[PDB]
């Protein structure tokens, strides 16, 4: 399951995580191709933000979509 999440400049994030995975580790790879550390990006799933494991099936199991992450600091 490829990821095409936009960013502050409409960039790309490669989560490469299936809908059965948790956003605690799914967002780790998404920001790995972006630059942010995993425990720093408050990823917003077009109306909600991940918390704890946050299994990707909860967010409608969307394929790629446009996840406009929040780049707030001091979240670790």
């Amino acid at each position: 399951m490829l990821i095409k999440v936009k960013t502050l400049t409409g960039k790309e994030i490669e989560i490469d995580i299936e809908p059965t995975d948790k956003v605690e580790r799914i967002k780790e790879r998404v920001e790995e191709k972006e630059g942010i550390p995993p425990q720093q990006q408050r990823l917003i799933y077009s109306g909600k933000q991940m918390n704890d494991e946050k299994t990707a099936a909860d967010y409608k199991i969307l394929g790629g979509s446009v996840l406009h992450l929040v780049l707030a600091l001091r979240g670790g």
Partner: protein, 627 residues
């Protein structure tokens, strides 16, 4: 009794006679006067049944009430004509105002006041010639109607007829001993109106009647009025008056071609050079007694042209398309002194043509000079700012740089305009302040558009600082709209309209950068509107966090950059987090939110309603009001 008067009034207005007679049958004298005379509000007119019958041209209805029922002809009523509202007009005034000959003669035979005066000092004879009926004018004049009586604007029966296209009443009134030297409020006579109207036949009758041309209240000869208003044949009608000398003939001929160089409805290039050719040729006629034109120094806005002081100077630009348009602007401004309320119209039209012809620097210069002339002339330059915004956004929408000092001058002109616009709102009473308030809101919208364009400029540091200083001055002149909205409030508001004409393609609201520029200019982020909402309370109400997330996010972090208080509560007692209606917006606010003991303490005090007045510092009371 109340319902019956409505049908009787409707019967007289709609022309039915049999129904009107049936209702008025078996009516006592008390009901006769009450039914005939009671005012009814129909179509904005507080007219009596007799007045509306004369207004609608129902002679039979009027005749029946007059001859047998004996209705008064001195009753005062209100009517609504073509763009004019007249109050207090009798049945005779409206019948002649509506141009009904079959009703005027019945009323005068009954004994109506022929010299009756309405609220605006108006005579039924004046209303007769205003409508355009010759038969009513001739009959009313013979029935002791004072032609010399003018309105509160000092406009006589001849002057109102001269502006209209009715020569028949003009000829009769002129020979009926009507003074052609009578002046309006601004010194204007009948020929002043006729020259602007453009009636050859009316002007011919005036000069033969010893017009004795004089200047108006603006110091403008009406012979140049025809030249100013692109009246080709009217200019070549008073030059043979044998009292216009030679210098005044030069001014009349130069102005007409100059106006013809720049006119949307009178655009021509052969008559542009033709009239200027004869004026300068008449200058170079004496030879050893040359009459030199008072050439003003060349203006940077109008290129670098110093007019034509030689006959061969204009000959070299005979086929020049650009020079003829440019030269006409210079000579017309030189002739009129840039003091006319309409001298900017050829300039603004030439700039509009240049903008429509993909010319930018010239049109910007012309529009800037026009704005300067209108601002020193104290004009409501809201459409000016709107078209500046349109041309700037069109220039930036085609990816061409726009010079900041040109933007700086119009922005520096806008703030003085807005400062006077706020004065215009405050000084003008509650009569046209509703249009003044809308004009001020339009000025604020245009200022937002120009600053949005400025965000796309190259932003040279000194000129950018100048723009920031002008916006700083505007902010320190505390601009607030009728909803309590500041420039920040409308900047963060998505509901704020953006002009469709070549502007909405660039300026999109809400815009984060201009708001950021508002924060760089020290705008009060903690302001409250009439609703009690701040900019934070309105920006969270945006219904599109997906299509444009950044314009929703970058503003909020820009919002909380100089003291935006996230925990303040509006008049309607709603936290900005409560007024979210969007998970992204509320989570952004929470990430930008920072806790404070004062916030929770004030919220606890207000939620439990402890008396804090005269017991806590006044700033703490203001913070309590914030919560």
């Amino acid at each position: 009794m109340e319902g019956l008067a409505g049908y009787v009034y409707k019967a007289a207005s709609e022309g039915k006679v049999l129904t009107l007679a049936a209702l008025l049958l078996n009516r006592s004298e008390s009901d006769i006067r009450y039914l005939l005379g009671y005012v009814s509000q129909q179509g904005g007119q507080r007219s009596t049944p007799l007045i509306i019958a004369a207004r609608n041209g129902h002679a039979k209805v009027v005749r029946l009430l007059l001859e047998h029922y004996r209705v008064q002809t001195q009753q005062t009523g209100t009517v609504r004509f073509d763009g004019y509202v007249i109050d207090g007009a009798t049945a005779l005034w409206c019948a002649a105002g509506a141009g009904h000959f079959e009703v005027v003669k019945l009323l005068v035979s009954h004994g109506a006041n022929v010299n009756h005066t309405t609220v605006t000092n108006s005579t039924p004879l004046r209303a007769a010639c205003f409508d355009g009926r010759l038969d009513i004018v001739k009959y009313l004049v013979e029935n002791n109607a004072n032609i010399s009586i003018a309105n509160k604007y000092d406009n006589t029966c001849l002057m109102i007829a001269a502006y209209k296209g009715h020569t028949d009443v003009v000829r009769y009134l002129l020979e009926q001993r009507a003074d052609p030297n009578a002046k309006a409020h601004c010194g204007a006579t009948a020929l002043h109106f006729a020259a602007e109207a453009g009636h050859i036949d009316i002007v011919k009758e005036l000069i033969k009647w010893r017009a004795a041309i004089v200047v108006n209240g603006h110091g403008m000869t009406p012979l140049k009025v025809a030249a100013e208003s692109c009246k080709a044949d009217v200019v070549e009608l008073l030059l043979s008056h044998a009292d216009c000398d030679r210098r005044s003939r030069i001014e009349a001929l130069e102005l007409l071609g100059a106006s013809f160089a720049n006119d949307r409805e009178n655009y021509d290039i052969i008559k542009t050079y033709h009239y200027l050719y004869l004026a300068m040729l008449e200058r170079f006629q004496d030879g050893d007694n040359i009459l030199e034109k008072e050439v003003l120094p060349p203006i940077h806005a109008y290129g670098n042209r110093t007019e034509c002081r030689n006959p061969q100077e204009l000959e070299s630009i005979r086929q020049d398309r650009d020079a003829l348009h440019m030269e006409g602007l210079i000579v017309r401004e030189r002739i009129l002194g840039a003091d006319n309320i309409d001298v900017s119209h050829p300039i603004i039209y030439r700039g509009a043509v240049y903008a429509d012809n993909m010319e930018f620097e010239q049109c910007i210069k012309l529009w800037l000079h026009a704005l300067h002339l209108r601002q020193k002339g104290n004009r409501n330059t809201h459409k000016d700012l709107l078209r500046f915004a349109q041309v700037f956004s069109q220039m930036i929408h085609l990816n061409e740089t726009v010079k900041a000092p040109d933007i700086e001058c119009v922005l520096r002109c806008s703030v003085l305009e807005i400062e006077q616009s706020m004065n215009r709102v405050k000084n003008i009473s509650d009569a046209d302040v509703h249009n003044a308030m809308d004009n001020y809101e339009c000025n604020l919208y245009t200022f937002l558009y120009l600053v949005c364009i400025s965000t796309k400029t190259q932003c040279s540091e000194e000129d950018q600082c100048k723009i920031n200083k002008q916006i700083y001055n505007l902010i320190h002149l505390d601009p607030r709209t009728r909803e309590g909205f500041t420039l920040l409030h409308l900047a963060v508001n998505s509901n704020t309209p953006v002009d469709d004409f070549h502007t909405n393609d660039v300026c999109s609201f809400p815009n984060a950068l201009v708001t950021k520029l508002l924060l760089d200019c020290g705008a009060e982020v903690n302001a409250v509107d009439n609703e009690g909402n701040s900019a934070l309370h309105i920006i969270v109400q945006y219904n599109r966090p997906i299509s444009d997330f950044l314009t929703l996010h970058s503003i909020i972090i820009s919002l909380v950059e100089a003291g935006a208080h996230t925990d303040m509560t509006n008049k309607q007692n709603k936290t900005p987090l409560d007024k979210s209606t969007t998970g992204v917006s509320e989570i952004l606010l929470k990430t930008q939110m920072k806790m404070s003991l004062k916030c929770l303490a004030a919220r606890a005090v207000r939620a439990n309603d402890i008396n804090y007045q005269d017991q806590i510092p006044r700033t703490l009371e203001e913070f309590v009001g914030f919560h």
